[PDB]
Design an enzyme around this catalytic site. Structure first.
Site, mmCIF file in Angstrom:
data_model
loop_
_atom_site.group_PDB
_atom_site.id
_atom_site.type_symbol
_atom_site.label_atom_id
_atom_site.label_comp_id
_atom_site.label_asym_id
_atom_site.label_seq_id
_atom_site.Cartn_x
_atom_site.Cartn_y
_atom_site.Cartn_z
ATOM 1 N N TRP A 93 -9.184 6.216 -0.994
ATOM 2 C CA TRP A 93 -9.480 6.955 -2.212
ATOM 3 C C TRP A 93 -8.522 6.481 -3.286
ATOM 4 O O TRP A 93 -7.471 5.902 -2.990
ATOM 5 C CB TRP A 93 -9.367 8.471 -2.028
ATOM 6 C CG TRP A 93 -8.140 8.883 -1.322
ATOM 7 C CD1 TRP A 93 -6.893 9.087 -1.871
ATOM 8 C CD2 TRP A 93 -8.013 9.132 0.078
ATOM 9 N NE1 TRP A 93 -6.009 9.456 -0.887
ATOM 10 C CE2 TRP A 93 -6.670 9.490 0.318
ATOM 11 C CE3 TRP A 93 -8.906 9.091 1.153
ATOM 12 C CZ2 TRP A 93 -6.200 9.799 1.593
ATOM 13 C CZ3 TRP A 93 -8.441 9.400 2.418
ATOM 14 C CH2 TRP A 93 -7.099 9.751 2.626
ATOM 15 N N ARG A 137 -0.212 4.525 2.843
ATOM 16 C CA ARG A 137 -0.257 4.233 4.275
ATOM 17 C C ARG A 137 0.094 5.413 5.166
ATOM 18 O O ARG A 137 0.001 5.277 6.393
ATOM 19 C CB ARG A 137 0.669 3.078 4.613
ATOM 20 C CG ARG A 137 0.107 1.734 4.262
ATOM 21 C CD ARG A 137 1.122 0.669 4.592
ATOM 22 N NE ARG A 137 2.197 0.632 3.609
ATOM 23 C CZ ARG A 137 3.353 -0.006 3.782
ATOM 24 N NH1 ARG A 137 3.590 -0.667 4.916
ATOM 25 N NH2 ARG A 137 4.264 0.008 2.815
ATOM 26 N N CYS A 164 0.822 -1.206 0.000
ATOM 27 C CA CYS A 164 0.000 0.000 0.000
ATOM 28 C C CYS A 164 0.856 1.256 0.000
ATOM 29 O O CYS A 164 1.591 1.516 0.954
ATOM 30 C CB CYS A 164 -0.956 0.034 1.200
ATOM 31 S SG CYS A 164 -2.000 1.497 1.160
ATOM 32 N N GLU A 171 -4.556 3.894 -10.799
ATOM 33 C CA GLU A 171 -5.298 2.643 -10.744
ATOM 34 C C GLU A 171 -6.459 2.665 -11.725
ATOM 35 O O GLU A 171 -6.802 1.634 -12.313
ATOM 36 C CB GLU A 171 -5.806 2.370 -9.339
ATOM 37 C CG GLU A 171 -4.813 2.557 -8.236
ATOM 38 C CD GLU A 171 -5.510 2.366 -6.886
ATOM 39 O OE1 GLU A 171 -6.038 1.250 -6.655
ATOM 40 O OE2 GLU A 171 -5.571 3.332 -6.089
HETATM 41 C C1 HEM Z 1 -6.400 6.291 1.750
HETATM 42 C C2 HEM Z 1 -6.145 6.153 0.455
HETATM 43 C C3 HEM Z 1 -5.440 4.888 -0.098
HETATM 44 C C4 HEM Z 1 -4.694 4.876 -1.201
HETATM 45 C C5 HEM Z 1 -4.343 6.075 -2.118
HETATM 46 C C6 HEM Z 1 -4.213 3.525 -1.398
HETATM 47 C C7 HEM Z 1 -3.405 3.105 -2.431
HETATM 48 C C8 HEM Z 1 -3.147 1.788 -2.738
HETATM 49 C C9 HEM Z 1 -2.685 1.248 -4.000
HETATM 50 C C10 HEM Z 1 -2.390 2.091 -5.259
HETATM 51 C C11 HEM Z 1 -2.566 -0.082 -3.866
HETATM 52 C C12 HEM Z 1 -2.108 -1.066 -4.968
HETATM 53 C C13 HEM Z 1 -3.268 -1.979 -5.357
HETATM 54 C C14 HEM Z 1 -3.344 -2.096 -6.857
HETATM 55 O O1 HEM Z 1 -2.501 -1.467 -7.549
HETATM 56 O O2 HEM Z 1 -4.243 -2.817 -7.361
HETATM 57 C C15 HEM Z 1 -2.955 -0.438 -2.508
HETATM 58 C C16 HEM Z 1 -2.985 -1.695 -1.943
HETATM 59 C C17 HEM Z 1 -3.392 -2.057 -0.672
HETATM 60 N N1 HEM Z 1 -4.034 -1.221 0.235
HETATM 61 FE FE1 HEM Z 1 -3.926 0.821 0.078
HETATM 62 N N2 HEM Z 1 -4.730 2.731 -0.376
HETATM 63 C C18 HEM Z 1 -5.503 3.536 0.451
HETATM 64 C C19 HEM Z 1 -6.187 3.112 1.578
HETATM 65 C C20 HEM Z 1 -6.104 1.869 2.168
HETATM 66 C C21 HEM Z 1 -6.825 1.426 3.357
HETATM 67 C C22 HEM Z 1 -7.823 2.318 4.133
HETATM 68 C C23 HEM Z 1 -6.463 0.146 3.602
HETATM 69 C C24 HEM Z 1 -6.860 -0.855 4.688
HETATM 70 C C25 HEM Z 1 -7.721 -0.575 5.688
HETATM 71 C C26 HEM Z 1 -5.509 -0.246 2.568
HETATM 72 C C27 HEM Z 1 -4.907 -1.474 2.488
HETATM 73 C C28 HEM Z 1 -4.284 -1.963 1.371
HETATM 74 C C29 HEM Z 1 -3.797 -3.307 1.165
HETATM 75 C C30 HEM Z 1 -3.870 -4.441 2.205
HETATM 76 C C31 HEM Z 1 -3.252 -3.364 -0.067
HETATM 77 C C32 HEM Z 1 -2.570 -4.578 -0.752
HETATM 78 C C33 HEM Z 1 -3.455 -5.817 -0.885
HETATM 79 C C34 HEM Z 1 -2.861 -6.792 -1.879
HETATM 80 O O3 HEM Z 1 -1.911 -7.539 -1.512
HETATM 81 O O4 HEM Z 1 -3.361 -6.838 -3.034
HETATM 82 N N3 HEM Z 1 -5.310 0.828 1.733
HETATM 83 N N4 HEM Z 1 -3.297 0.731 -1.868
HETATM 84 C C1 LIG Z 2 -7.889 0.455 -0.027
HETATM 85 C C2 LIG Z 2 -7.451 0.667 -1.453
HETATM 86 C C3 LIG Z 2 -7.369 1.945 -1.990
HETATM 87 C C4 LIG Z 2 -6.976 2.097 -3.322
HETATM 88 N N1 LIG Z 2 -6.881 3.331 -3.869
HETATM 89 N N2 LIG Z 2 -6.678 1.011 -4.076
HETATM 90 C C5 LIG Z 2 -6.756 -0.241 -3.569
HETATM 91 C C6 LIG Z 2 -6.459 -1.334 -4.371
HETATM 92 C C7 LIG Z 2 -6.526 -2.625 -3.858
HETATM 93 C C8 LIG Z 2 -6.216 -3.790 -4.740
HETATM 94 C C9 LIG Z 2 -7.056 -4.021 -5.831
HETATM 95 C C10 LIG Z 2 -6.826 -5.096 -6.690
HETATM 96 C C11 LIG Z 2 -5.755 -5.953 -6.456
HETATM 97 C C12 LIG Z 2 -5.483 -7.121 -7.382
HETATM 98 C C13 LIG Z 2 -5.257 -6.619 -8.816
HETATM 99 N N3 LIG Z 2 -4.290 -5.496 -8.888
HETATM 100 C C14 LIG Z 2 -4.929 -5.728 -5.358
HETATM 101 C C15 LIG Z 2 -5.154 -4.653 -4.502
HETATM 102 O O1 LIG Z 2 -4.337 -4.439 -3.438
HETATM 103 C C16 LIG Z 2 -6.904 -2.816 -2.534
HETATM 104 F F1 LIG Z 2 -6.981 -4.066 -2.041
HETATM 105 C C17 LIG Z 2 -7.220 -1.724 -1.729
HETATM 106 C C18 LIG Z 2 -7.142 -0.434 -2.245
#
Ligand code: HEM
Ligand SMILES: Cc1cc(N)nc2cc(-c3ccc(CCN)cc3O)c(F)cc12
Ligand code: HEM
Ligand SMILES: Cc1cc(N)nc2cc(-c3ccc(CCN)cc3O)c(F)cc12
Ligand SMILES: C[C@H](O)[C@H](O)[C@H]1CNc2nc(N)[nH]c(=O)c2N1
Ligand SMILES: C[C@H](O)[C@H](O)[C@H]1CNc2nc(N)[nH]c(=O)c2N1
Ligand SMILES: [Zn+2]
Lengths: 412, 412
Positions: free
Chosen positions: A281, A112, A109, A286
């Protein structure tokens, strides 16, 4: 035993000792690195007390009362309840800490820096799919907050036996439907095609169009899941226009405001919350890079190239890149002009570097997955490309879990 | 024991068993992944025979005579020469195989589809820095081939004791000089500033300008290194113009045709070749993204934004990305219009995916470093972003080695 991560765009060096707390395994060995594998990989009461103790020891060490009176009694309280019930229940405060730290430890993430400002909705009194729908609707409304998005998580009851599981079958609360065609191609979102037909299976009536918001499929206490449609007034959407190219509206593109992932598992002191949708958000990329320009997603680089007067014959004219930058200027501009929270990959990655320094300072490290932290466009002009990162699995954590239709002992 | 890598843009799956041959360690453990650490980390005659045997066993297994008559005699021949000399010498053919396979095993190299078409110049009879200069000049001329670039490597004598070392002190045969300024800023290439003043130390007379080609600093048989200037007719350069923006010439930018890295160590059957410059051709992004747009390099996103009529006040206008795509259309176009070999990051990464399939087919795997294989722009619209990769260290290999000025026992 005290490893060093360097930044190579600023020559800045930090020392990681937080990885010593790491417990789980990464998939890498001394002779193989799996840091680009996408998904590498019922509990008993013996296993549960070290996990509970470890968690309680860091919770009470975080409110500045480690090993004190309240901690040793809570230790005994949970020990006794794991002897008695072969499980236990978290305090409201322990649940909120655990949730915030699962986010804090999510190494993939980039967002964070906000981890401590997370709103934790305790839905552990939920018993039915309708109850789940209600909690989720309040989640969506609260986190959306009329475009001034707020981070939130709703935590349904923990796994007990394993056949009484709460699950959101949707991978995200708000997803656009995907419909295969006669000619094989795909309308809507190709990612969700299988889910979009699972909904039709359980009885969805599909408005077979483009940006059709999917219904919820909610499984409560192991029962077969049930369909509920989020009130459309609760689903906030941003029409995508460009601040130069007026033919961008003719593209007719929109995305939902709320990224709210619902298919993952939250682990807190050995307790497994199989339904714990969480939202923040969107970072611009993405939507504008992966959602729109992935080959197996909306795959719209075709048109954006065309309307721009682009040399599509040669692979080396970089027409693909050129349409990709415009698409991301357009999502950002569209979201900001509608006061819907969005962050560009430049600000989000600078914030993460800042966040990383904070972690190494007051925590001793920050598990980070370079492969996922670097944005999927313009990687090396963002500060995270040049930042070495140690990845390791701390707990509490969010974990992947299989889709429920592969695992559910159906009956109805 | 037989691991699987998946592609997620094509759902294509390959099975890796080549990693079982892996010997060296990766820096990762079961509890930490270091796949984003940039550089993680004298020999005896005991250690040398397993390395020689292992290498000879794969060389003779590659000419379809494993364990045969010639192999068991060569084994004994090298065994006897390691007893006698506490080292040994490679056959011309063993040297060429070893070199091609060090390239073949370079997991960070996206260009390895060409690995078998490598020209190996045997400079193991070299004794003086002038000899080295001569060999290097012939290397540059040969590999440049008037813009129809050809892959090549020149292999100077192997390390013996450790104080008689052949080294090119340049990090690349052809590098632009970097000069600090009165006001602190940098003319030329900020990467090479320290080397550009090491040359001035040993006696270089700097034409303190922009794209000034550095002199060679050649150390032979451990002696103090000596300066030689490559004849400018041998240094091919491409002036960078854009195929739309005629103010791009006014930028006054040019890059050299030949990327020829000279600071690394080639390891072949336990033998250490500390000077082994090798060259291919540039992928567009190394110049147009990293060389030009890195913060601590030429850092030209300033001007390219300006002249394009760009909104530089807001970080979220993506003006940085927008100038970055144009710069890379311009390097590609400039190189191709001058018939100088260049590959765009789309073709090079598709070629690598194709190459990866070939490896897993006829070899059982392909060590690949995702962090380095994904190009530093438009990562997710190239096929390698979506390709899982196993990284592991096979041998023969190219290895990093410290800069010679940190290690050399000087005397003069
Ligand atoms: C507040 C604004 C947030 C932004 C801008 C953000 C951004 C991102 C991005 C860009 C990813 C990559 C996922 C992808 O590319 O498909 C990600 C993954 C992730 N986010 Fe954040 N996120 C936010 C909030 C949160 C919150 C509130 C949580 C948990 C309560 C969280 C937990 C996670 C987790 C666990 C992953 C990785 C899961 C996996 O292994 O696929 N995020 N986030
Ligand atoms: C909280 C949150 C915010 C954000 N702005 N984006 C998020 C993207 C993913 C997420 C979505 C898809 C996949 C698998 C394909 N990439 C992994 C992810 O971590 C997620 F879980 C959480 C997100
Ligand atoms: C033929 C055209 C070639 C292309 C297009 C190419 C492309 C690349 C690129 C883009 C990188 C990443 C380096 C960076 O981003 O700074 C790289 C690294 C590397 N290349 Fe290739 N290369 C080519 C030829 C060769 C040859 C001929 C050799 C060896 C004989 C070689 C060996 C390596 C090695 C060892 C690395 C990684 C070294 C490290 O750890 O830094 N390449 N290549
Ligand atoms: C043969 C070859 C061809 C090419 N087209 N490019 C190459 C880039 C590098 C290279 C350059 C710098 C660094 C450190 C800073 N990135 C690592 C490298 O691997 C290299 F060795 C060899 C290359
Ligand atoms: C093959 C690779 O592991 C896979 O495509 C990963 C790479 N990094 C990613 N990073 C983010 N943020 N999101 C992703 O979906 C992926 N996909
Ligand atoms: C921090 C990170 O390890 C470092 O910036 C790496 C990332 N990947 C790279 N990939 C390539 N091709 N070249 C590089 O210089 C780097 N730098
Ligand atoms: Zn690893």
């Amino acid at each position: 035993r005290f490893l060093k991560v360097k930044n190579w765009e600023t020559d800045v060096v930090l020392t990681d000792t937080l990885h010593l707390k790491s417990t789980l395994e990464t998939g890498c060995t001394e002779h193989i690195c799996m840091g680009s594998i996408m998904l590498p990989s019922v509990a008993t009461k013996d296993q549960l007390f070290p996990l509970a103790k470890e968690f309680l020891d860091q919770y009470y060490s975080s409110i500045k009362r480690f090993g004190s009176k309240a901690h040793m009694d809570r230790l005994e309280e949970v020990n006794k309840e794991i002897e008695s019930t072969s499980t236990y229940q978290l305090k409201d405060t322990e649940l909120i800490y655990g949730a915030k730290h699962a986010w804090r430890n999510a190494s993939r993430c980039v967002g964070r820096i906000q981890w401590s400002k997370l709103q934790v909705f305790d839905a552990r009194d939920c018993t039915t799919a309708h109850g789940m729908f209600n909690y989720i609707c309040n989640h969506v409304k609260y986190a959306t907050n009329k475009g001034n998005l707020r981070s939130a998580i709703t935590i349904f009851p923990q796994r007990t036996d394993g056949k009484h599981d709460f699950r959101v079958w949707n991978s995200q609360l708000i997803r656009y439907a995907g419909y295969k065609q006669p000619d094989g191609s795909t309308l809507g979102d190709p990612a969700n095609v299988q889910f979009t037909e699972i909904c039709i299976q359980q009885g969805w009536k599909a408005p077979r169009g483009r940006f059709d918001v999917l219904p919820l499929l909610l499984q409560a206490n192991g029962n077969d899941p049930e369909l509920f449609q989020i009130p459309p007034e609760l689903v906030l959407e941003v029409p995508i226009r460009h601040p130069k190219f007026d033919w961008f509206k003719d593209l007719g593109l929109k995305w939902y405001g709320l990224p709210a992932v619902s298919n993952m598992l939250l682990e807190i002191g050995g307790l497994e919350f199989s339904a714990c949708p969480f939202s923040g958000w969107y970072m611009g990329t993405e939507i504008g890079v992966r959602d729109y320009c992935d080959n197996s997603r909306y795959n719209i680089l075709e048109e954006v190239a065309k309307k721009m007067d682009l040399d599509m014959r040669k692979t080396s004219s970089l027409w693909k890149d050129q349409a990709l930058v415009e698409i991301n200027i357009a999502v950002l501009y569209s979201f900001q002009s509608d006061k819907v929270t969005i962050v560009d990959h430049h600000s989000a990655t600078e914030s993460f570097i800042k966040h990383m320094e904070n972690e190494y300072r007051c925590r001793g490290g920050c598990p980070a997955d370079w492969v996922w932290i670097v944005p999927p466009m313009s990687g090396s002009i963002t500060p995270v490309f040049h930042q070495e990162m140690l990845n390791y699995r701390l707990t509490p954590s969010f974990e992947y879990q299989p889709d429920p239709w592969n695992t559910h002992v159906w009956k109805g």
